Amino acid sequence: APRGNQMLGNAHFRKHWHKRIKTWFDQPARKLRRRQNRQAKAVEIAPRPVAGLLRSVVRCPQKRYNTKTRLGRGFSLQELKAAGISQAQARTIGIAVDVRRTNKTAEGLKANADRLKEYKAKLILFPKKASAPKKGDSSAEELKVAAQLRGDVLPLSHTITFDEPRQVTDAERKVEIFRLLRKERADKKYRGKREKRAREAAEE
Amino acid sequence: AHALRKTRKLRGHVSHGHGRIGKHRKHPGGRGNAGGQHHHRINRDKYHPGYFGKVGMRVFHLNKNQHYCPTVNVERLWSLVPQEVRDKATGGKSPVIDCTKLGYFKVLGKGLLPETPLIVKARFFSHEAEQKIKKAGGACVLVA
Amino acid sequence: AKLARAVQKAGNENKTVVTLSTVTDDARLYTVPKISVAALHVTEGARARILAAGGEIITLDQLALKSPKGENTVFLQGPRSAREAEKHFGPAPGVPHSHTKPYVRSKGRKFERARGRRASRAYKN
RNA sequence: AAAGCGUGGCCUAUCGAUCCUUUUAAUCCUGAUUGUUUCAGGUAAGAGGUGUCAGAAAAGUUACCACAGGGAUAACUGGCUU
RNA sequence: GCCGUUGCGACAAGGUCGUAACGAGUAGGAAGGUCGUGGCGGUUGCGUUGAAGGCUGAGCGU
RNA sequence: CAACGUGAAUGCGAGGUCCAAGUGGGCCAUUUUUGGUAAGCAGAACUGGCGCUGUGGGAUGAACCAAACGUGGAGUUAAGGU
RNA sequence: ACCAUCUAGUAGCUGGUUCCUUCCGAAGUUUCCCUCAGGAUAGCUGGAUCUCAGGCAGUUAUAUUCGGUAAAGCUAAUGAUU
RNA sequence: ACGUUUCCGACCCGUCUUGAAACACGGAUUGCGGAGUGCUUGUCUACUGCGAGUCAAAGGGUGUUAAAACCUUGCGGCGAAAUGAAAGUAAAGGUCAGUCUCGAAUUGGCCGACGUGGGAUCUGUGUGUGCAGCGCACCACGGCCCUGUGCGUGU
RNA sequence: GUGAAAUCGCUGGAGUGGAACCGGAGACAGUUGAU
RNA sequence: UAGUAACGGCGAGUGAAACGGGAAGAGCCCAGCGCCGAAUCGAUCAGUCUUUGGCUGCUUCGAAAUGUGGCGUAUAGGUGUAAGUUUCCAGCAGUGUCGUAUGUCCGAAGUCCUUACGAUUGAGGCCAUAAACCAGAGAGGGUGCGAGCCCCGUUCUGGAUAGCGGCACUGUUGGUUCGCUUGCUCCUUGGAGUCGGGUUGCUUGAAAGUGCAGCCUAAAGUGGGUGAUAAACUUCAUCUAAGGC
């Protein structure tokens, strides 16, 4: 029997919730377990990076996020072709391939092409058989510097830059920004009705 | 803090502060928000007007990202300018503010602008915001 | 902003503003005059601006040493009734001519907006 | 003619929430892959009714009976009244 | 006369003191408790020359 | 803006906001009063009580008369009495 | 029927509800409810306090008002009636 | 002082109840156990830190008195903007002086969070008290601005 | 191990007319203190 | 995200997902079309080896053309051609390098003096300014309650030893490799009582049908599905169901 000014109750506890209870007392244990797994993987696959395959640069889908970038599943076939890497070579060299992703814009393609080029520049390739090096294979004093990389490979930078101060131009000042926005909205809203009127006029 | 609850002071008194006549008895009025229309009608109408009934268009699977549009007032714009940019903006140069990078999509014209003209880049502007910026001597630039 | 407004008034330019309320920084304030203030706590931005503008910040014991009887003082405080909790105080939301804020889980067309809030549903108060 | 009077009946009774349906209103808003027209849904005002009238959808029997209580409540005594 | 509450006040004090009036109480609400019990982080000590527990005289506290 | 200055008695500091308990069976009495033949019956009005309350008196009593309560002392009384 | 489990089934109903002092201290009334052994609501009550330092009062005075009961009248209207 | 004897007082507790010592119910006696809790979600209140910000999640890095502590966030929650069913729109005026097609016009300066009354305090000045000035919080009465809607025009 | 209360037996004292217990105030017995 | 969109005698109540930040990350195989066309496979026999299983065959039977194997699957694929580039598996032995909740063995210092006790581990003293001694061991337990120093133990990111594993390199046995990528050329490219529709029942937040199933109906080939309000006519966007690891 609620009394006085209250916020109406909303608790979802009318089910036999005591049968389905999950506690987090093992959070530090899980943290330690994952650290140990990472260490074991690093030992297993040394000197290769612990993170694993190299991932691509992506733009977040929706307009709420499209001003940001993040890591992707892999590199598109167009991107690999532009960077001059075969899909098989990427697979054996440790580059993620996104067989589903396709490029529709030169800027997006070029960003990942540059990422691939930089990774190839930073790559160190050990001889297949230590005794006999081959072509494309890294040099001995380069191999002496090889060390395991921890964290993301070629991590992205999320720093925000401020545009340089400039001068306000009269062409800029003369524009009617609000009227322009309202005009665009009106044009989009009334496109179809205008087409119908034009068709009716043509028939007449 | 069990040592500070009423239970510590109610020991020795038979009714535990719930009365001898009324008594503390389970659910004497019903469970939850029951009877909001019959016997809790006065309380419901007094403290939660508008509760019963339905009003407005119903949107199957609302798309909240579409309507997401954080706003910044014109009075708050200068505070977004870093001190280094303010130092650089000298001799007729106005600082440039990228509201979309700062996390604001629309600019609303509440308050007053500083003496320094500003260039503001946002997806949307209000008419008053545009008027105030241009009057202060800056410019408004639309971005996608 | 309130501190500056108090100090800019004719005759208050040299008096010390005394407040037991925390002095916060106002981003909407563009020009900050020279302020001499005694307070319990001053935020980082407000303190930086006050000191940069040539002002002075002292504690309550320093104020006691300066003006033991409170001479040349301007007593100020923040708005007491400006609280979200105070928004909910007053006549109940469901009584005539009441602008009290209700306790609602969320905001939207589906949260206490139908019956007793518009004439199209029973009545409106 | 005018000053004036007129939002129903000279005054004190003669009546109805939510949801749903239905009608009227805008050269209205929405259907979120782009549009047109149907269709559907909305904003505003009415009607369809709850007479237990602040508004559940509702026939009996038990002497075969049961449970929680009640001296807040009857049948026998006692008490007041006659 | 003493105890305490309330109001006021003095004093360099989470305290002491002074002063005037006051003191019923079920349901109920608050405050104080160096009233009592069992743990933990600390601190102070006692103990086979006798701890806890148990029985019971001299006192203390409304 | 200019002038005028507290315009019956007595008593006394005043006002504001928030959070919340218990209660939502009452009963008695002077006077008024409806139903009833009446009722220690049923139903109302004002006020005071008991409930929540002890104390002196009415031999005894929830309500009657006196008077309300820290713990003690001296003196004097109320109603009532010798 | 019996056994185990759902199941510590629900109960507006009955019973119980465990230390001491100090301060304040009620209600059985209004409205709505398939409401009448129950709730919500206002009232009564406690606590936190905050803003101030003369306008208030379960009392009178002055001034002005409202009423249709007691009394009075039916040789005044209505209704009885010698 | 739970011994004895005197004088005064002295009905059995708990409970429901208008009313209990009741011919109302429970209580033969003693020991031990025995009942407002946990959590989720709100709200108010008190305290603490910071403050237009605050808290940061999962996670990562480190840590061997390693389930602790310490470091670490383009992003997330709450707050900073409301209003409408929605499309959408979205919170700066005060004063002075002008032109005028004298109107539901327009222009320019100064000031910039509005006006008035009451306001602890502060300041000045007379004689515990008076007058004047700047006025916090708050209260009262208004004024403007945003959005929805009715009427209603035009430029 | 300890070894409580209820209940019970013994020895000594004291009371003992249809309850017993209890509060206030003395007395007795008793206990205890006196540079 | 979020107690949000949505469902609900729109009452009580119920109630997700995408985007975003992270943990981990690995890709692939068929049918069909096309080419080779039995090039494939099981038992049995005989050799051979490192034999609770493997390798060879004019062994003999059988499965398989109602089609086993090779290439090949949406990122396609294939032919030819020009460039570049070209091994991979499994076992055995050795060499070290590293882990073992794997066994066994190994360890620093007082039972010193006085005292207390039924019994000490209790109290005091043990050169030295800083002192009984050890301490990388002052965790725990036992011993006549009390103990780092009496014992087992504890610390030595402990040692020695035997065994199990994983690694890296050498040797060696068996099997296997006409491939692989990019450019050009020509050819080629796919799941049916299934999808879809009607109706019925259950189910969901899914609202003119979210998922599932019964009955009737029952496809097509730039076809089919989806784009959350049903239908036609239109812009497109995005995947490729009815097979598998």
Ligand SMILES: C[C@@H]1C[C@@H]([C@H](O)CC2CC(=O)NC(=O)C2)C(=O)[C@@H](C)C1
């Ligand atoms: C206007 C009146 C009422 C209406 C309808 O039955 C009322 C609703 C009310 C409700 O909240 N839930 C229901 O299931 C019924 C109707 O068809 C007719 C009787 C006419």
